[PDB]
Amino acid sequence: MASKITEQVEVIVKPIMEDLNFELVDVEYVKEGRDHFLRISIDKEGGVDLNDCTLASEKISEAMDANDPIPEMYYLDVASPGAERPIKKEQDFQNAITKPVFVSLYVPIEGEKEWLGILQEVNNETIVVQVKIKARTKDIEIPRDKIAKARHAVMI
């Protein structure tokens, strides 16, 4: 496997997989004009959140940076799926609830089905979705009877 990525993927997988213990799925590195950009999909058990992506990004970036084997310098780019567990039936929906998530309802609210926010409460019938006003939450109840689509979500 003599592709450039394995170096990278490995290299960065070391400070990244080890230190915050999230691990490099792959870093594949892309050419934008004159610069090279090392774009990473990284993973962890249970999914990464933003901040974990950040954390990885510390790690990929800062850590790669603190532990640079590469005498040339390029631009570290962090990607990592936000929680993407579908919102269907209770367990997944609930397993989705802890995070901000978006759900779709078919009958138009401002014409739209899908609203992301923090799950505050679950009903069998309803989904209660936090919008955060500074430090304030408001939980919005989504009738399942209206629900077109429901999922855990990406800020990506």
Q: Whole domain around residue 15: which residue ranges?
A: 4-79
Beta strands, E only, 18-144: 23-32, 35-43, 75-79, 100-109, 112-122, 126-133, 136-143
CATH code at 10?
A: 3.30.300.70
Strand 75-79 relative to strand 136-143, pairing: unpaired
Distances (CA, A) of 93 to 56, 57, 89, 100, 146: 26, 28, 6, 11, 16
Same domain, 48 and 69: yes
* 59 and 112 part of one domain: no
Domain boundary (29, 60, 79) is at: 79
Question: What type of residue is 50?
Answer: L
Domain end point (choices 79, 112, 135): 79
Task: Please tell me the experimental approach by which this structure was elucidated.
Answer: NMR
The CATH number for 94's domain is 2.30.30.180
DSSP state of 62: I
The structural domain count of the chain equals 2
